[PDB]
Design a protein that fits this description.
This is part of a larger assembly, with 4 copies of chain A.
Chain A: E1 2-5, E2 24-29, E3 34-38, E4 47-48, E5 56-57, E6 64-69, E7 81-84, E8 87-90, E9 108-110, E10 116-117, E11 120-123, E12 126-133, E13 144-149, E14 157-162, E15 166-168, E16 172-180, E17 186-190, H1 196-204, E18 212-220
PDB class: viral protein/immune system
Keywords: 3-up, Antibody, viral protein-immune system complex
Entry title: SARS-CoV-2 Delta Spike in complex with JL-8C
């Protein structure tokens, strides 16, 4: 099943504090109204990892207790074993079978009515883990950086494991205008590339556009093919 | 016959096509210069919205639009080429055509004016029908009728001249009106068109100038060298072409202040010479002023 | 008996202000000029960075002077661009300040006979208001509003004399002199010179003379 | 170089793209002007001298206009209510009843405090 993630996947791009500013950053966030893939575990197959993923879940029993991030997953690439009991984070390798058992390693670390959103990233070897626990609804909630890991590895495939409804996202490089409040948190956001009224809002750097006509961007027709010509079969 | 300029030609520039036409690494280094043509585009848009204010302050001095009645007994002027003829498809007046007769794409875009040549000539014929049929009283609200041999008598008594000149010599007025416009059939107006033309032409020919680098074309610099040293060569092209834009835009801002000073003078002459009689000496022509007639020459007005 | 017309309309028009396009534009244009200037301190202009401390303290002084020379040119062109926009924008404001000085002299410190200089209509009087970085003129003007239609002739020879007038007006059958205030036709504001072949379009009607009664 | 027919080179269709909107307190749907380009290149298609104007509807009537389009077209927001693209009306088409005997001054007055 596929569904519509309305305004989700908007996290804090930096640890800078800002208060009541309309800040425009060009960071990879989950686009608005994108295509997110609803799954049902009634199992948990392979997933595509491109530029990080927006995870989510909707459980009243806290049943998901595992992430396994690896290309080969046979104790060759650095996999992870994140568990939510505290978010205890085992970045070391365990010898997995075809399906790891429910009910020499490098790094170990300890830090109906619930959403568990888990935006991931891998830029400059800094494996970022964001989070938000908010009891896909019609609303808006920013995601705070929960932990960061300077592993410096390449990952391209993963599989969430439990001892039943987990969603995946698609992160793309996209301009985004943020809206901080008095409290220093994000209360609204605008993508400025989805529909023509949105990119008006970035050119004004505001939210309440007044009645008028605004030169938002420039139109250009890209070339289609190439035409290279040289004279008739002369020389021989 | 006074020829005043009103509006310049509206021009908007796109930087990433001008400086860095079909190049991505040029756009990346143009981004490294921060934000120079965000404000260049706001400078040129401020000029372009200003020209719409200039044309709408001079001609749109009245809310209504008055029609010349189908019987036209307006004292006898050469109003066939003055008042509009229904023969021309793109409707103007032949006097406006006489002034029309006498007067590319490399990122530069010549945006059209809002107030078209037919709509300006409808404003002007409303001012002509307002002046003839209603005099000065059409400047308060709508038109409030006045006969022609009553309004020029009152245009005598308002400048201390006795009212016994056009009341006795009307055939002198209609013949001298034919002869003086006959002498006419545009120094200030052709100047404004020419200065805009040389400004854009020097801007285009700057792309043939290498600014001390190896070449003035984008692709040869990219093919011959590599991001070690092409980086230095393309920096000369960008900072050469960016100074060419700032030179052009600064010359456009100074030239738009000149045209706005002549647009406030043409708005003052429309108010005080057309919508009324001026007591000011040598403001609405040499001599004792009776009344004026607006004539919508291209990018200007002829009083 | 029309100070009650004025006071209500003066209170309604000050209410319609309560219920600033030129002035708020001036405040905003200065703000964007200053804000673009400060954001130029985050531009590289081709250098490694924009904070002057790390250009000095990341690499050797041999080529640090070259890199800071590129940075100082970008900052100086940004400062020259800001100054030449302030000089042009101050010439615009000085044209508005000389127009406000002319309106103070001719509309407040006197009455202007100029048409549509101190407001639409027959200008009566102005009041300046000391607005932020500007001035608000309450142009009290005499505007007649709801239109009419009379009937008049170029001159009126009564018994052989062409008059030069004040406006001959007539509601449909009788002639009034005139603001729409029908007053009696009198030779006080019309003076006699000529004849009724000496003004084209002339019709024949009475002219009340004040020496007779 | 192969045959001897002479063929021109005219540049690709570029231009600006402007967004015509009411207030966000008023409406949410917008029109999209494409400046200068005839719009066989690029919702309700509408061609003007300014360029293509998609997303708004042509209206044969004429009103005192609100949002400047360009080249004698203006946009507004009304009939539910949508965005309409019409030729600007220039004011009421009054006809003055001028005669050889006619004068006019308006009846009452407003002491207008401009």
């Amino acid at each position: 099943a596929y569904t519509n993630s309305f305004t989700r996947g908007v996290y804090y791009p930096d640890k800078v504090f800002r208060s009541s500013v309309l800040h425009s950053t060009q960071d990879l966030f989950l686009p608005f109204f994108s295509n997110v893939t609803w799954f049902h575990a009634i199992d948990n197959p392979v997933l595509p990892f491109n530029d990080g993923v927006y995870f989510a879940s909707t459980e009243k029993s806290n049943i998901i207790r595992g992430w396994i991030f690896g290309t080969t997953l046979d104790s060759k690439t650095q996999s992870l074993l994140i568990v939510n009991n505290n978010v205890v984070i085992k970045v070391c390798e365990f010898q997995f079978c075809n399906d790891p058992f429910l009910d020499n390693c490098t790094f170990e670390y300890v830090s109906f009515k619930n959403l568990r959103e888990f935006v991931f990233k891998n830029i400059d070897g800094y494996f970022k883990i964001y989070s938000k626990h908010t009891p896909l609804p019609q609303g808006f909630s920013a995601l705070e950086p929960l932990v960061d890991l300077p592993i410096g590895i390449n990952i391209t495939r993963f599989q969430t494991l439990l001892a039943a409804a987990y969603y995946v996202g698609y992160l793309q490089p996209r301009t985004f205008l943020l809206k901080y409040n008095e409290n220093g948190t994000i209360t609204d956001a605008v993508d400025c590339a989805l529909d023509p009224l949105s990119e008006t809002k970035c050119t004004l750097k505001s939210f309440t556009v007044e009645k008028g006509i605004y030169q938002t961007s420039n139109f250009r027709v890209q070339p289609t093919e190439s035409i290279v010509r040289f004279p008739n079969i002369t020389n021989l | 016959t006074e020829i005043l300029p009103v509006s310049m030609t509206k021009t908007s520039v796109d930087c990433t096509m001008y400086i860095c036409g079909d190049s991505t690494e040029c756009s990346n280094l143009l981004l490294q210069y921060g934000s120079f043509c965000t404000q260049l585009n706001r400078a040129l848009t401020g000029i372009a919205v200003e020209q719409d204010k200039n044309t709408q302050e001079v001609f749109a001095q009245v809310k209504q639009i008055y029609k010349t009645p189908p019987i036209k007994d307006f004292g006898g002027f050469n109003f066939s080429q003055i008042l509009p003829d229904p023969s021309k498809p793109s409707k103007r007046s032949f006097i406006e055509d006489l002034l029309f007769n006498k007067v590319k794409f490399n990122g530069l875009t010549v945006l059209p004016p809002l107030l078209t040549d037919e709509m300006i000539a409808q404003y002007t014929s409303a001012l002509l029908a307002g002046t003839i049929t209603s005099g000065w009283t059409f400047g308060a609200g709508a038109a409030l009728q006045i006969p022609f041999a009553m309004q020029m008598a009152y245009r005598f008594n308002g400048i201390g001249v006795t009212q016994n000149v056009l009341y006795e010599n009307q055939k002198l007025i209609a013949n001298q009106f034919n002869s003086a416009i006959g002498k006419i059939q545009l120094g200030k107006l052709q100047n404004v068109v020419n200065q805009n033309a040389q400004a854009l032409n020097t801007l285009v020919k700057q792309l043939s100038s290498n600014f001390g680098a190896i070449s003035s074309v984008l692709n040869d610099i990219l093919s011959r060298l590599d991001p070690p040293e092409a980086e230095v060569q393309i920096d000369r092209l960008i900072t050469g072409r960016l100074q060419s834009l700032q030179t052009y835009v600064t010359q456009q801002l100074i030239r738009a202040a000149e045209i706005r000073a002549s647009a406030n003078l043409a708005a003052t002459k429309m108010s005080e010479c057309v919508l009324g009689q001026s007591k000011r000496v040598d403001f609405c022509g040499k001599g004792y002023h009776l009344m004026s007639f607006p004539q919508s020459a291209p990018h200007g007005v002829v009083f | 008996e029309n100070q009650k017309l004025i006071a209500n309309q003066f209170n309604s028009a000050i209410g319609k202000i309560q219920d600033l396009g030129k002035l708020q534009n001036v405040v905003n244009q200065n703000a964007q000029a200053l804000n673009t200037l400060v954001k130029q301190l985050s531009s590289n202009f081709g250098a490694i960075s924009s904070v002057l401390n790390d250009i000095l303290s990341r690499l050797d002084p041999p080529e640090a002077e070259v890199q800071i020379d590129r940075l100082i040119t970008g900052r100086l062109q940004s400062l020259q661009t800001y100054v030449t926009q302030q000089l042009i924008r101050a010439a615009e404001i000085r044209a508005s300040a000389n127009l406000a000085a002319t309106k103070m002299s001719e509309c407040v410190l006197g009455q202007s006979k100029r048409v549509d200089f101190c407001g639409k209509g027959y200008h009566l009087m102005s009041f300046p208001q000391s607005a932020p970085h500007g001035v608000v003129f309450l142009h009290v003007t005499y505007v007649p509003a709801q239109e009419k239609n009379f009937t008049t002739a170029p001159a009126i020879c009564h018994d052989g004399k062409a008059h030069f007038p004040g406006v001959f007006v007539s509601n449909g059958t009788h002639w009034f002199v005139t603001f729409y205030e029908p007053q009696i036709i009198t030779t006080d504001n019309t003076f006699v010179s000529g004849n009724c072949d000496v003004v084209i379009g002339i019709v024949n009607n009475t002219v009340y003379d004040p020496l007779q009664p | 170089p192969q045959t001897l027919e002479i063929l021109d080179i005219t540049p690709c269709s570029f231009g600006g793209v402007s967004v015509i909107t009411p207030g966000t307190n008023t409406s949410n749907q917008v029109a999209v002007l494409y400046q200068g380009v005839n719009c066989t290149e690029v919702s309700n298609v509408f061609q003007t001298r300014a360029g293509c104007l998609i997303g708004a509807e042509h209206v044969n009537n004429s009103y005192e206009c609100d949002i400047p389009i360009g080249a004698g077209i203006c946009a507004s927001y009304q009939t539910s209510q949508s965005i309409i693209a019409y030729t600007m009306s220039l004011g009421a088409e009054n006809s003055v009843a001028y005669s050889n005997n006619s004068i006019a001054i308006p009846t009452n007055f407003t002491i207008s405090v401009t």
